[PDB]
Write a protein that binds this ligand. Sequence first.
Ligand code: HEC
Length: 104
Amino acid sequence: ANGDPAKGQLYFENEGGCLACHSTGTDKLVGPGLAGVMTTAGPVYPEGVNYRGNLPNGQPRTEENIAAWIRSGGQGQIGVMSPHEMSDEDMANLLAYLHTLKRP
Ligand code: HEC
């Protein structure tokens, strides 16, 4: 919505620390690559991991549930997320930058 992908990228690289665990493409550092994470197809998971088209916590793939997962974190078959509480404008910018990540 009212998100800034430049501020979103700055939060992704510094104030959020997401790049140190997540790749902007389809590679896997600690978690899955967030390429296409904001689309209905989801990101690229390693072979064997499957959440049945939903988030690792069980909720479907929507902006609200993805934001709630990011703020809450959790553990799935791959690794462990950390809780990243953030303001609403920062979350909007972060979701915008995640939208900028396209999965081929
Ligand atoms: C290392 C501690 C990480 C940090 C820093 C960030 N993420 Fe994370 N993320 C990590 C793991 C190990 C996983 C997979 C969990 C599992 O085992 O199932 C994830 C997952 C996500 C997801 C969901 C992916 C999906 O397929 O639905 C999202 C949307 C996500 N991560 C986003 C995200 C953001 C916005 C971060 C900065 C606040 C961030 N991650 C940091 C590990 C780590």
